[PDB]
Amino acid sequence: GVSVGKCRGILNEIKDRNKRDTMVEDLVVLVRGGASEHITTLAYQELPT
Amino acid sequence: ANDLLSKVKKDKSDSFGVTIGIGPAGSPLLVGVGVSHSQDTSFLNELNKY
């Protein structure tokens, strides 16, 4: 009697994920006219109102 | 922001066996033959980058 069994197995799997996001915001003011404390308080760089 | 990932696994298995029986009679005789074999292979690899 002759009997011989052959079995071969192989597995492969790769998963990849990448995400990138950016957001930039700027605000510039320009005031000319006023010397009293009113323009000094208005010269606050920190809300455009 | 960047993300990199890679995880792979490999598995392999093999087995074989042979059996032989011969006997002359006429003065009875007997001969027995037994063969066994088994092979297993496993591989694991994982990579992650951020």
Coordinates of all heavy atoms in Angstrom, one line a residue, unseen atoms left out:
Chain A
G1 N 0.8 -1.2 0.0 CA 0.0 0.0 0.0 C 0.8 1.3 0.0 O 1.9 1.3 0.6
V2 N 0.4 2.3 -0.7 CA 1.1 3.5 -0.9 C 0.0 4.7 -0.7 O -1.0 4.7 -1.3 CB 1.8 3.7 -2.2 CG1 2.3 5.1 -2.4 CG2 2.9 2.7 -2.3
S3 N 0.3 5.6 0.3 CA -0.5 6.7 0.5 C 0.3 7.9 1.1 O 1.1 7.6 2.0 CB -1.7 6.3 1.5 OG -2.5 7.5 1.7
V4 N 0.1 9.1 0.5 CA 0.8 10.2 1.0 C 0.0 11.5 0.7 O -0.5 11.7 -0.4 CB 2.2 10.4 0.4 CG1 2.2 10.2 -1.2 CG2 2.9 11.7 0.7
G5 N -0.3 12.3 1.7 CA -1.1 13.5 1.6 C -0.3 14.7 1.7 O 0.6 14.8 2.6
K6 N -0.6 15.7 0.9 CA 0.1 17.0 0.9 C -0.9 18.1 1.1 O -1.9 18.2 0.5 CB 0.9 17.2 -0.4 CG 1.7 18.4 -0.5 CD 2.5 18.5 -1.8 CE 3.4 19.8 -1.8 NZ 4.2 19.9 -3.0
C7 N -0.6 19.0 2.1 CA -1.4 20.1 2.4 C -0.5 21.4 2.5 O 0.6 21.3 3.1 CB -2.2 19.9 3.7 SG -3.4 18.6 3.6
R8 N -1.0 22.5 1.9 CA -0.2 23.7 1.9 C -1.2 24.9 2.2 O -2.2 25.0 1.5 CB 0.5 23.9 0.6 CG 1.4 25.2 0.6 CD 2.2 25.3 -0.6 NE 3.3 24.2 -0.7 CZ 4.0 24.0 -1.7 NH1 3.9 24.7 -2.8 NH2 4.9 23.0 -1.7
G9 N -0.9 25.7 3.2 CA -1.7 26.9 3.5 C -0.9 28.1 3.7 O 0.3 28.1 4.1
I10 N -1.4 29.2 3.3 CA -0.8 30.5 3.4 C -1.8 31.6 3.5 O -2.9 31.6 2.9 CB 0.1 30.8 2.2 CG1 0.9 32.1 2.3 CG2 -0.6 30.7 0.8 CD1 2.0 32.3 1.3
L11 N -1.6 32.6 4.4 CA -2.5 33.7 4.6 C -1.8 35.0 4.6 O -0.6 35.1 5.0 CB -3.2 33.5 6.0 CG -4.3 34.5 6.3 CD1 -5.4 34.4 5.4 CD2 -4.8 34.3 7.8
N12 N -2.4 36.0 4.1 CA -1.8 37.4 3.9 C -2.9 38.4 4.0 O -3.9 38.3 3.4 CB -1.0 37.5 2.6 CG -0.2 38.8 2.5 OD1 -0.2 39.6 3.5 ND2 0.5 38.9 1.4
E13 N -2.7 39.4 4.8 CA -3.6 40.5 5.0 C -2.9 41.7 5.6 O -2.1 41.6 6.5 CB -4.8 40.1 5.9 CG -5.9 41.1 6.1 CD -7.0 40.7 7.1 OE1 -6.9 39.5 7.6 OE2 -7.9 41.4 7.3
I14 N -3.2 42.9 5.0 CA -2.6 44.1 5.5 C -3.7 45.2 5.3 O -4.3 45.3 4.3 CB -1.3 44.5 4.7 CG1 -0.2 43.6 4.9 CG2 -0.9 46.0 5.0 CD1 1.0 43.7 4.0
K15 N -3.9 46.0 6.4 CA -4.8 47.1 6.4 C -4.1 48.4 6.8 O -3.3 48.4 7.7 CB -6.0 46.8 7.3 CG -7.1 47.9 7.3 CD -8.2 47.5 8.2 CE -9.3 48.5 8.2 NZ -10.5 48.2 9.1
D16 N -4.4 49.5 6.1 CA -3.7 50.8 6.3 C -4.8 51.9 6.2 O -5.7 51.8 5.4 CB -2.6 51.0 5.3 CG -1.7 52.2 5.7 OD1 -1.9 52.8 6.7 OD2 -0.8 52.5 4.9
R17 N -4.6 52.9 7.0 CA -5.5 54.0 7.0 C -4.7 55.3 7.5 O -4.0 55.2 8.5 CB -6.7 53.8 7.9 CG -7.8 54.9 7.8 CD -9.0 54.6 8.6 NE -10.0 55.7 8.6 CZ -11.2 55.6 9.1 NH1 -11.6 54.5 9.8 NH2 -12.0 56.6 9.1
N18 N -4.9 56.4 6.9 CA -4.2 57.6 7.3 C -5.2 58.8 6.9 O -5.8 58.8 5.9 CB -2.9 57.8 6.5
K19 N -5.2 59.8 7.9 CA -6.0 60.9 7.7 C -5.3 62.2 8.2 O -4.7 62.1 9.3 CB -7.4 60.8 8.4
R20 N -5.4 63.3 7.5 CA -4.8 64.5 7.9 C -5.7 65.7 7.5 O -6.3 65.7 6.5 CB -3.4 64.7 7.2
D21 N -5.8 66.7 8.5 CA -6.7 67.8 8.2 C -6.1 69.0 9.0 O -5.6 68.8 10.1 CB -8.1 67.5 8.7
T22 N -6.2 70.2 8.4 CA -5.7 71.4 9.0 C -6.7 72.6 8.7 O -7.4 72.5 7.7 CB -4.3 71.8 8.5 OG1 -3.9 73.0 9.2 CG2 -4.3 72.0 7.0
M23 N -6.7 73.6 9.6 CA -7.6 74.7 9.4 C -6.9 75.9 10.1 O -6.5 75.9 11.3 CB -8.9 74.5 10.1 CG -9.9 75.7 9.9 SD -11.5 75.4 10.6 CE -11.1 75.4 12.4
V24 N -6.7 77.0 9.3 CA -6.0 78.2 9.7 C -6.9 79.4 9.5 O -7.6 79.5 8.5 CB -4.7 78.4 9.0
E25 N -7.0 80.3 10.5 CA -7.8 81.4 10.5 C -7.1 82.6 11.1 O -6.4 82.5 12.1 CB -9.2 81.3 11.3
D26 N -7.2 83.8 10.4 CA -6.5 85.0 10.9 C -7.5 86.2 10.8 O -8.5 86.2 10.0 CB -5.3 85.3 10.0
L27 N -7.2 87.2 11.6 CA -8.0 88.4 11.6 C -7.1 89.6 11.9 O -6.3 89.6 12.8 CB -9.1 88.3 12.6
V28 N -7.1 90.6 11.0 CA -6.3 91.8 11.1 C -7.2 93.1 11.2 O -8.2 93.1 10.4 CB -5.3 91.9 10.0 CG1 -4.5 93.2 10.1 CG2 -4.4 90.7 9.9
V29 N -6.9 94.0 12.0 CA -7.7 95.3 12.1 C -6.8 96.4 11.8 O -5.5 96.4 11.8 CB -8.2 95.4 13.6
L30 N -7.4 97.5 11.4 CA -6.7 98.7 11.0 C -7.5 99.9 11.4 O -8.6 100.2 10.9 CB -6.5 98.8 9.5 CG -5.7 99.9 8.9 CD1 -4.3 100.0 9.5 CD2 -5.6 99.9 7.4
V31 N -7.0 100.7 12.4 CA -7.7 101.9 12.9 C -6.8 103.1 12.8 O -5.6 103.0 13.2 CB -8.1 101.6 14.4 CG1 -8.9 102.8 14.9 CG2 -9.0 100.4 14.5
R32 N -7.3 104.2 12.3 CA -6.6 105.4 12.2 C -7.5 106.6 12.6 O -8.5 106.8 11.9 CB -6.0 105.6 10.8 CG -4.7 104.7 10.6 CD -4.1 105.0 9.2 NE -5.0 104.4 8.1 CZ -4.7 104.5 6.8 NH1 -3.7 105.3 6.4 NH2 -5.5 104.0 5.9
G33 N -7.1 107.3 13.6 CA -8.0 108.4 14.0 C -8.5 108.3 15.5 O -9.4 107.6 15.7
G34 N -7.8 109.0 16.4 CA -8.3 108.9 17.8 C -7.1 108.8 18.8 O -6.3 107.9 18.7
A35 N -7.0 109.8 19.7 CA -5.9 109.8 20.6 C -6.3 109.6 22.1 O -5.5 109.2 22.9 CB -5.1 111.2 20.5
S36 N -7.6 110.0 22.4 CA -8.1 109.8 23.7 C -8.2 108.3 24.1 O -7.9 107.4 23.3 CB -9.5 110.5 23.9
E37 N -8.6 108.1 25.4 CA -8.7 106.7 25.9 C -9.7 105.9 25.1 O -9.7 104.7 25.2 CB -9.1 106.7 27.3
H38 N -10.6 106.6 24.3 CA -11.6 105.8 23.5 C -10.9 105.0 22.5 O -11.2 103.8 22.4 CB -12.5 106.8 22.8
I39 N -10.0 105.6 21.7 CA -9.2 104.8 20.7 C -8.3 103.8 21.4 O -7.9 102.8 20.8 CB -8.5 105.7 19.8
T40 N -7.8 104.1 22.6 CA -7.0 103.2 23.4 C -7.7 101.9 23.7 O -7.2 100.8 23.5 CB -6.4 103.8 24.6
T41 N -9.0 102.1 24.2 CA -9.8 100.9 24.4 C -10.2 100.2 23.1 O -10.3 99.0 23.0 CB -11.1 101.3 25.2
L42 N -10.4 101.0 22.0 CA -10.7 100.4 20.7 C -9.5 99.7 20.1 O -9.7 98.9 19.2 CB -11.2 101.5 19.8
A43 N -8.3 100.1 20.5 CA -7.1 99.4 20.0 C -6.8 98.1 20.6 O -5.8 97.5 20.3 CB -5.8 100.3 20.3
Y44 N -7.8 97.5 21.3 CA -7.6 96.2 21.9 C -7.7 95.1 20.8 O -8.7 95.0 20.1 CB -8.7 95.9 22.9
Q45 N -6.5 94.4 20.6 CA -6.5 93.4 19.5 C -7.4 92.3 19.8 O -7.8 91.6 18.8 CB -5.0 92.9 19.4
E46 N -7.9 92.0 21.0 CA -8.8 91.0 21.3 C -10.2 91.4 21.1 O -10.5 91.9 20.0 CB -8.6 90.5 22.8
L47 N -12.7 89.5 18.7 CA -14.1 90.2 18.7 C -14.1 91.5 18.0 O -13.8 92.5 18.6 CB -14.5 90.3 20.2
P48 N -14.4 91.5 16.7 CA -14.4 92.7 15.9 C -15.7 93.5 16.1 O -16.5 93.7 15.2 CB -14.3 92.2 14.5 CG -14.9 90.8 14.5 CD -14.6 90.3 15.9
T49 N -16.0 93.8 17.4 CA -17.2 94.6 17.7 C -17.0 95.2 19.1 O -16.2 94.7 19.9 CB -18.5 93.7 17.7
Chain B
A1 N -1.3 65.2 10.9 CA -1.4 63.9 11.6 C -1.3 62.8 10.5 O -1.9 62.9 9.5 CB -2.7 63.7 12.4
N2 N -0.5 61.8 10.9 CA -0.3 60.6 10.0 C -0.3 59.3 10.8 O 0.2 59.3 11.9 CB 1.0 60.7 9.2 CG 1.1 59.7 8.1 OD1 0.2 59.0 7.8 ND2 2.3 59.8 7.4
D3 N -0.9 58.3 10.2 CA -1.1 57.0 10.8 C -0.7 55.9 9.9 O -1.1 55.9 8.7 CB -2.5 56.8 11.4 CG -2.6 55.6 12.3 OD1 -1.5 55.0 12.6 OD2 -3.7 55.3 12.8
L4 N 0.1 54.9 10.3 CA 0.5 53.8 9.5 C 0.4 52.5 10.3 O 0.8 52.5 11.5 CB 2.0 54.0 9.0 CG 2.6 52.9 8.1 CD1 1.8 52.9 6.8 CD2 4.0 53.2 7.9
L5 N -0.2 51.5 9.7 CA -0.5 50.3 10.4 C -0.3 49.1 9.4 O -0.7 49.3 8.2 CB -1.9 50.2 11.0 CG -2.2 49.1 12.0 CD1 -3.1 49.6 13.1 CD2 -2.8 47.9 11.3
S6 N 0.2 48.0 9.8 CA 0.4 46.8 9.0 C 0.5 45.6 9.9 O 1.5 45.5 10.7 CB 1.6 47.0 8.1 OG 1.8 45.8 7.3
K7 N -0.4 44.7 9.8 CA -0.4 43.5 10.6 C -0.7 42.3 9.7 O -1.9 42.2 9.2 CB -1.4 43.6 11.8 CG -1.5 42.3 12.7 CD -2.4 42.5 13.8 CE -3.9 42.4 13.3 NZ -4.8 42.5 14.5
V8 N 0.2 41.4 9.6 CA 0.1 40.2 8.7 C 0.4 38.9 9.5 O 1.3 38.9 10.3 CB 1.0 40.3 7.5 CG1 2.4 40.4 7.9 CG2 0.8 39.2 6.5
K9 N -0.4 37.9 9.2 CA -0.2 36.6 9.8 C -0.2 35.5 8.8 O -1.0 35.5 7.9 CB -1.3 36.3 10.9 CG -1.1 35.0 11.7 CD -2.1 34.9 12.8 CE -2.0 33.6 13.5 NZ -0.7 33.5 14.2
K10 N 0.7 34.5 9.0 CA 0.9 33.4 8.0 C 0.9 32.1 8.8 O 1.5 32.0 9.8 CB 2.2 33.6 7.2 CG 2.4 32.5 6.2 CD 3.7 32.7 5.4 CE 3.9 31.6 4.4 NZ 5.2 31.8 3.6
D11 N 0.1 31.1 8.3 CA 0.0 29.8 8.9 C 0.1 28.8 7.8 O -0.5 28.9 6.7 CB -1.3 29.7 9.6 CG -1.3 30.5 10.9 OD1 -0.3 30.7 11.5 OD2 -2.4 30.9 11.3
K12 N 0.8 27.7 8.1 CA 1.0 26.6 7.2 C 1.1 25.3 7.9 O 1.6 25.2 9.0 CB 2.4 26.8 6.4 CG 2.5 25.7 5.2 CD 3.8 26.0 4.4 CE 4.0 25.0 3.3 NZ 5.2 25.3 2.5
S13 N 0.5 24.2 7.3 CA 0.4 22.9 8.0 C 0.5 21.9 6.9 O -0.1 22.0 5.8 CB -0.9 22.8 8.8 OG -1.0 23.7 9.8
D14 N 1.2 20.8 7.2 CA 1.4 19.7 6.3 C 1.6 18.4 7.1 O 2.3 18.4 8.1 CB 2.5 19.9 5.3 CG 2.7 18.8 4.3 OD1 1.8 18.7 3.4 OD2 3.6 18.0 4.4
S15 N 1.0 17.3 6.6 CA 1.2 16.0 7.3 C 1.0 14.9 6.3 O 0.1 15.0 5.4 CB 0.2 15.9 8.4 OG 0.4 16.8 9.5
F16 N 1.8 13.9 6.4 CA 1.7 12.7 5.5 C 2.2 11.5 6.2 O 3.1 11.5 7.1 CB 2.4 12.9 4.2 CG 3.9 13.1 4.3 CD1 4.8 12.1 4.2 CD2 4.4 14.4 4.6 CE1 6.2 12.3 4.4 CE2 5.8 14.6 4.7 CZ 6.6 13.5 4.6
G17 N 1.6 10.3 5.9 CA 2.0 9.1 6.5 C 1.8 7.9 5.6 O 0.8 7.8 4.9
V18 N 2.8 7.0 5.6 CA 2.8 5.8 4.7 C 2.7 4.5 5.5 O 3.4 4.4 6.5 CB 4.0 5.8 3.8 CG1 4.0 4.6 2.8 CG2 4.1 7.1 3.0
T19 N 1.9 3.6 5.1 CA 1.8 2.3 5.7 C 1.9 1.2 4.7 O 1.3 1.3 3.6 CB 0.5 2.1 6.5 OG1 -0.6 2.3 5.5 CG2 0.3 3.2 7.6
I20 N 2.8 0.2 4.9 CA 3.1 -0.8 4.0 C 3.0 -2.2 4.7 O 3.6 -2.3 5.8 CB 4.4 -0.7 3.3 CG1 4.4 0.6 2.5 CG2 4.7 -1.9 2.4 CD1 5.8 1.0 2.0
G21 N 2.3 -3.1 4.2 CA 2.3 -4.5 4.8 C 2.5 -5.6 3.7 O 1.7 -5.7 2.8
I22 N 3.6 -6.3 3.9 CA 3.9 -7.4 2.9 C 4.1 -8.7 3.7 O 4.8 -8.7 4.7 CB 5.2 -7.0 2.1 CG1 5.0 -5.7 1.4 CG2 5.5 -8.1 1.1 CD1 6.3 -5.1 0.9
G23 N 3.5 -9.8 3.2 CA 3.7 -11.1 3.8 C 3.6 -12.2 2.8 O 2.6 -12.4 2.1
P24 N 4.6 -13.0 2.7 CA 4.5 -14.2 1.9 C 4.1 -15.4 2.7 O 4.4 -15.5 3.9 CB 6.0 -14.5 1.4 CG 6.7 -13.2 1.7 CD 6.0 -12.6 2.9
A25 N 3.2 -16.3 2.2 CA 2.7 -17.4 2.8 C 2.7 -18.6 1.9 O 2.3 -18.5 0.7 CB 1.3 -17.2 3.4
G26 N 3.1 -19.8 2.4 CA 3.1 -21.0 1.6 C 4.5 -21.7 1.7 O 5.5 -21.1 2.0
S27 N 5.0 -21.7 4.8 CA 5.9 -20.7 5.6 C 5.3 -19.3 5.6 O 5.7 -18.5 4.8 CB 7.3 -20.7 5.1 OG 8.1 -19.8 5.8
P28 N 4.3 -19.1 6.5 CA 3.7 -17.8 6.6 C 4.7 -16.8 7.1 O 5.4 -17.1 8.0 CB 2.5 -18.0 7.5 CG 2.2 -19.5 7.5 CD 3.6 -20.1 7.3
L29 N 4.6 -15.6 6.5 CA 5.5 -14.5 6.9 C 4.7 -13.2 6.9 O 3.7 -13.0 6.2 CB 6.7 -14.4 6.0 CG 8.0 -13.6 6.5 CD1 9.2 -14.3 6.0 CD2 7.9 -12.2 6.0
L30 N 5.2 -12.2 7.8 CA 4.5 -11.0 7.9 C 5.6 -9.9 8.1 O 6.5 -10.0 8.8 CB 3.5 -10.9 9.1 CG 2.8 -9.6 9.3 CD1 1.8 -9.3 8.1 CD2 2.0 -9.7 10.6
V31 N 5.4 -8.7 7.4 CA 6.2 -7.6 7.5 C 5.3 -6.3 7.6 O 4.4 -6.2 6.7 CB 7.2 -7.4 6.3 CG1 7.9 -6.1 6.4 CG2 8.2 -8.6 6.3
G32 N 5.6 -5.5 8.6 CA 4.8 -4.3 8.7 C 5.7 -3.1 8.6 O 6.8 -3.1 9.1
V33 N 5.2 -2.0 8.0 CA 5.9 -0.8 7.8 C 5.0 0.4 8.1 O 3.9 0.5 7.6 CB 6.5 -0.6 6.4 CG1 7.1 0.8 6.1 CG2 7.5 -1.7 6.1
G34 N 5.5 1.3 9.0 CA 4.7 2.5 9.4 C 5.5 3.7 9.3 O 6.6 3.8 9.8
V35 N 4.9 4.8 8.6 CA 5.6 6.0 8.5 C 4.6 7.1 8.9 O 3.4 7.1 8.5 CB 6.1 6.2 7.0 CG1 6.7 7.6 6.8 CG2 7.1 5.2 6.7
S36 N 5.1 8.1 9.6 CA 4.3 9.3 10.0 C 5.1 10.5 9.9 O 6.3 10.5 10.2 CB 3.7 9.1 11.4 OG 3.0 10.2 11.8
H37 N 4.5 11.6 9.5 CA 5.2 12.9 9.3 C 4.1 14.0 9.5 O 3.0 13.9 9.0 CB 5.9 13.0 8.0 CG 7.1 12.2 7.9 ND1 8.3 12.6 8.5 CD2 7.4 11.1 7.3 CE1 9.3 11.7 8.3 NE2 8.7 10.8 7.5
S38 N 4.5 15.1 10.1 CA 3.7 16.3 10.3 C 4.6 17.5 10.3 O 5.6 17.5 11.0 CB 2.8 16.2 11.6 OG 2.0 17.3 11.7
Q39 N 4.1 18.6 9.7 CA 4.8 19.8 9.6 C 3.8 21.0 9.8 O 2.8 21.0 9.2 CB 5.6 20.0 8.3 CG 6.7 19.0 8.0 CD 7.8 19.2 9.0 OE1 8.2 20.3 9.3 NE2 8.4 18.0 9.5
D40 N 4.2 21.9 10.7 CA 3.4 23.1 10.9 C 4.3 24.4 10.9 O 5.4 24.3 11.5 CB 2.6 23.0 12.2 CG 1.6 21.9 12.2 OD1 1.0 21.7 11.2 OD2 1.3 21.3 13.3
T41 N 3.8 25.4 10.3 CA 4.5 26.7 10.2 C 3.6 27.8 10.5 O 2.5 27.9 9.9 CB 5.2 26.8 8.8 OG1 6.0 25.7 8.6 CG2 6.0 28.1 8.7
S42 N 4.0 28.7 11.4 CA 3.2 29.9 11.7 C 4.1 31.1 11.7 O 5.2 31.1 12.2 CB 2.5 29.7 13.1 OG 1.8 30.9 13.5
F43 N 3.6 32.2 11.2 CA 4.3 33.5 11.1 C 3.4 34.6 11.4 O 2.2 34.7 11.0 CB 4.9 33.7 9.7 CG 5.7 35.0 9.6 CD1 7.0 35.0 10.2 CD2 5.2 36.1 8.9 CE1 7.8 36.2 10.1 CE2 6.0 37.2 8.8 CZ 7.2 37.3 9.4
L44 N 3.9 35.6 12.2 CA 3.1 36.7 12.7 C 4.0 38.0 12.6 O 5.1 37.9 13.1 CB 2.5 36.5 14.1 CG 1.7 37.7 14.6 CD1 0.4 37.9 13.8 CD2 1.3 37.4 16.1
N45 N 3.5 39.0 12.0 CA 4.2 40.3 11.9 C 3.2 41.4 12.0 O 2.2 41.4 11.3 CB 5.0 40.4 10.6 CG 6.0 41.5 10.6 OD1 6.1 42.3 11.6 ND2 6.7 41.7 9.5
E46 N 3.5 42.4 12.8 CA 2.6 43.6 13.0 C 3.5 44.8 13.1 O 4.5 44.9 13.9 CB 1.8 43.4 14.3 CG 0.8 44.6 14.5 CD -0.1 44.3 15.7 OE1 -0.1 43.2 16.2 OE2 -0.9 45.3 16.0
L47 N 3.1 45.9 12.4 CA 3.8 47.2 12.4 C 2.8 48.3 12.5 O 1.7 48.3 11.9 CB 4.6 47.3 11.1 CG 5.8 46.4 11.0 CD1 6.4 46.6 9.6 CD2 6.8 46.6 12.1
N48 N 3.1 49.3 13.3 CA 2.2 50.4 13.6 C 3.0 51.7 13.8 O 4.0 51.7 14.5 CB 1.3 50.2 14.8 CG 0.0 51.0 14.7 OD1 -0.9 50.7 15.5 ND2 -0.1 51.9 13.8
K49 N 2.7 52.7 13.0 CA 3.4 54.0 13.1 C 2.4 55.1 13.1 O 1.4 55.1 12.4 CB 4.4 54.1 11.9 CG 5.6 53.2 11.9 CD 6.5 53.4 10.7 CE 7.6 52.4 10.7 NZ 8.5 52.6 9.5
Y50 N 2.7 56.1 14.0 CA 1.9 57.3 14.1 C 2.8 58.5 14.2 O 3.8 58.6 14.8 CB 1.0 57.2 15.4 CG 0.1 58.4 15.5 CD1 -1.1 58.5 14.8 CD2 0.3 59.4 16.5 CE1 -2.0 59.5 14.9 CE2 -0.5 60.4 16.6 CZ -1.7 60.5 15.9 OH -2.6 61.6 16.0

